[PDB]
Amino acid sequence: GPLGSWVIPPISCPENEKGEFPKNLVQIKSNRDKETKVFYSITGQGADKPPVGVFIIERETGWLKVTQPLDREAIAKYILYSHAVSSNGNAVEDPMEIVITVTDA
């Protein structure tokens, strides 16, 4: 089913964060990494679509980060999709819908 071998914690981010960016949110992982090298990407509005690069993921490690302060009042919720592919580019998982909620903070 859609879960496949994904291991993903719930994702929430306080608005108006200060200090240094980027900031680690969660690590995304597929257990398909036991048999093959897995490469991670995220798609959606706030990732590869406007506003682009608000959220980024490390391709090899799966660390999902935020790059700037958020404003719940402007955007309360982001809908993204995590992807997992092998060295050949073929998907080892079905894209998992990831929901990022913005909180107060």
Partner: protein, 461 residues
């Protein structure tokens, strides 16, 4: 810098996107409209992120700029910033900047964001002694000597080729440091940064953490993906609330027992067989123990506040210590030896239940877990207690769907057949074992999976 004469916006700002932005800022109707130097001098801030800007030509005429955001554009050359000495804050992450020499005399800067660029050479930062925020990660920096005089820094990050941290020695104002994905083994200099509150050092080559001993103000620490085994020093860090030690070679958790302010603890991919030191960490909401050598998870029954727990890739038979953890939202225990899931009936808040590669035969305890949206039950495997080999061997089918219905075998070894509820073989000669498989799609709540497995039946001579 001054324009010689009143000039059209699109002759000053040669980049099409910038010209259009500048039109709005200057309150003009068209980019063809003429603006004066006096008009340009009124601009003190510029939020110009995500505009597809390829050139900042023209910005040298905005003499009074104190704060700019050119992040997430396509910038290379930043020469027009050279004489904008009123600049206090610059956001310029996610561009293609390699030459930061134009920043050299911007001594009023207190905030400089340059992560995700093409920077190797940071020598032009040496005189920016008022900096309190500097972000340089996702670059190709190996030499941080230019940071040695930045004695007002509070938050710092950089990457990705640094081995020598000695330039950090006098930066005692530091409160937040992220050195993730560098080539650092020696962190002895960090002992001098006694004001540190957060230290992120993921994916380095760190084996000795004794320098952290006096860093008692630390509340967040990530040493994920290093060379850690002995962690005795961590006992000194009683203010820690978030600790990530995943992907090391740790076995001894006794140093963590007194860290009662911990709410998040990541310990996956280690050498752990004993979690009794975790029994008193009652404020935990997130605990990761995947890819260890766990069998006894009894200490977990104490952790009443857990909402997220990972235990996959261990040697666990008895999952029942999770039964009282009624706040659990996501539970991951694939690749263990769990057969009985009766205790999971208690987990009414469970949304994600990952349990593939166990020894589960009976889904009936999961029937009322109708809040499940993600489910994994694939590839179960177990071996029954032996039965005597006979010419005709019959065993009951024990595979139960969530509804209580027996799932008929998908395949049966050695020519065997099924007449509900019995699996029967006709065996012309002694064989060590027989087997059967099952495979059944199932949805519980909204979570969908294939409940599948192989069942082995040993036969005694």
């Amino acid at each position: 810098a001054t324009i010689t004469q009143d000039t059209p916006i699109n002759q000053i700002f040669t980049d099409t996107a910038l010209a259009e932005k500048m039109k709005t800022v200057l309150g003009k109707t068209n980019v063809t409209d003429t603006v004066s130097q006096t008009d340009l001098d009124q601009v003190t801030t510029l939020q110009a992120d995500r505009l597809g800007i390829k050139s900042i030509d023209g910005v040298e005429y905005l003499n009074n700029l104190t704060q700019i955001n050119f992040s997430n554009n396509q910038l290379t050359d930043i020469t027009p910033l050279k004489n904008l000495t009123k600049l206090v804050d610059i956001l310029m992450n996610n561009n293609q900047i390699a030459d930061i020499t134009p920043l050299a005399n911007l001594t009023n800067l207190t905030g400089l964001t340059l992560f995700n660029n093409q920077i190797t050479d940071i020598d032009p930062l040496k005189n920016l002694t008022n900096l309190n925020r500097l972000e340089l990660s996702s670059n190709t920096i190996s030499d941080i000597s230019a940071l040695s005089g930045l004695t007002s820094l509070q938050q710092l990050n950089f990457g990705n080729q640094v081995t020598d941290l000695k330039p950090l020695a006098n930066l005692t104002t530091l409160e937040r440091l992220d050195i993730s994905s560098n080539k650092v083994s020696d962190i002895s200099v960090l002992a001098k940064l006694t004001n540190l509150e957060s230290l992120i050092a993921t994916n380095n080559q760190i084996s000795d953490i004794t320098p952290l001993g006096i860093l008692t103000n630390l509340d967040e620490l990530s040493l994920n993906g290093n060379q850690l085994k002995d962690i005795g020093t961590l006992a000194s860090l009683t203010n820690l609330t978030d600790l990530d030690l995943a992907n090391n070679q740790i076995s001894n958790l006794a140093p963590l027992s007194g860290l009662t302010k911990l709410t998040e603890l990541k310990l996956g991919a280690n050498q752990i067989s004993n979690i009794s030191p975790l029994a008193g960490l009652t404020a935990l909401t997130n605990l990761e123990l995947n890819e260890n050598q766990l069998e006894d998870i009894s200490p977990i029954s104490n952790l009443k506040n857990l909402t997220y727990l990972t235990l996959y890739f261990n040697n666990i038979s008895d999952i029942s210590p999770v039964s009282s953890l009624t706040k659990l939202q996501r539970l991951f225990f694939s690749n263990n030896k769990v057969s009985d899931v009766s205790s999971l009936a208690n987990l009414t808040n469970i949304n994600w239940l990952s349990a593939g590669h166990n020894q589960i035969s009976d889904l009936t305890p999961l029937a009322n877990l109708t809040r499940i949206t993600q489910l994994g039950l694939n590839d179960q495997a177990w071996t029954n207690a032996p039965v005597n080999y006979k010419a005709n061997v019959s065993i009951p089918n024990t595979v139960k769907n969530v509804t209580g219905a027996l799932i008929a075998p998908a395949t049966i070894s050695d020519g065997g057949s099924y007449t509900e509820p019995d699996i029967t073989w006709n065996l012309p000669s002694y064989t060590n074992e027989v087997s059967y498989t099952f495979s059944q799609p199932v949805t519980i709540g909204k979570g969908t999976t294939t409940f599948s497995g192989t069942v082995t039946q040993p036969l005694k001579a």
